[PDB]
Amino acid sequence: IISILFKSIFEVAFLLIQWYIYGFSLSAVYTCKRDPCPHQVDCFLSRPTEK
Amino acid sequence: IISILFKSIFEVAFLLIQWYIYGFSLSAVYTCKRDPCPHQVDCFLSRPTEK
């Protein structure tokens, strides 16, 4: 029973991190605001619909 | 005297137009905010000091 608890705890813990980090959809255009790039740039993904 | 005052008001009008539009010093980096470009770009001039 302890193993069956741990299997579900790991499963819901991995679902929560994916919900927090990425979302559940991918747009086609990303806007990036890092260095050494200037003010704001646009980047275009690869297969946003098939993923 | 009417010719002289006409040429002086023309002179001061052109000085005021140049003060309003350009200023009196060119920087070396311009920030451009126009379509069809993306969000904000920056363009480098040519000889900003000799001008």
UniProtKB/Swiss-Prot annotation, chains A, B:
Location in the cell: Cell membrane; Cell junction, Gap junction; Endoplasmic reticulum
Post-translational modifications: Sumoylated with SUMO1, SUMO2 and SUMO3, which may regulate the level of functional Cx43 gap junctions at the plasma membrane. May be desumoylated by SENP1 or SENP2. Acetylated in the developing cortex; leading to delocalization from the cell membrane.
Regions that span the bilayer: 1-21
Tissue specificity of this protein: Expressed at intercalated disks in the heart (at protein level). Expressed in the fetal cochlea.
Positions on the Extracellular side per record topology: 22-51
Related illness: Oculodentodigital dysplasia: A disease characterized by a typical facial appearance and variable involvement of the eyes, dentition, and fingers. Characteristic facial features include a narrow, pinched nose with hypoplastic alae nasi, prominent columella and thin anteverted nares together with a narrow nasal bridge, and prominent epicanthic folds giving the impression of hypertelorism. The teeth are usually small and carious. Typical eye findings include microphthalmia and microcornea. Oculodentodigital dysplasia, autosomal recessive: A disease characterized by a typical facial appearance and variable involvement of the eyes, dentition, and fingers. Characteristic facial features include a narrow, pinched nose with hypoplastic alae nasi, prominent columella and thin anteverted nares together with a narrow nasal bridge, and prominent epicanthic folds giving the impression of hypertelorism. The teeth are usually small and carious. Typical eye findings include microphthalmia and microcornea.
Family, as annotated: Belongs to the connexin family. Alpha-type (group II) subfamily.
Function: Gap junction protein that acts as a regulator of bladder capacity. A gap junction consists of a cluster of closely packed pairs of transmembrane channels, the connexons, through which materials of low MW diffuse from one cell to a neighboring cell. May play a critical role in the physiology of hearing by participating in the recycling of potassium to the cochlear endolymph. Negative regulator of bladder functional capacity: acts by enhancing intercellular electrical and chemical transmission, thus sensitizing bladder muscles to cholinergic neural stimuli and causing them to contract.
Name of this chain's protein: Gap junction alpha-1 protein
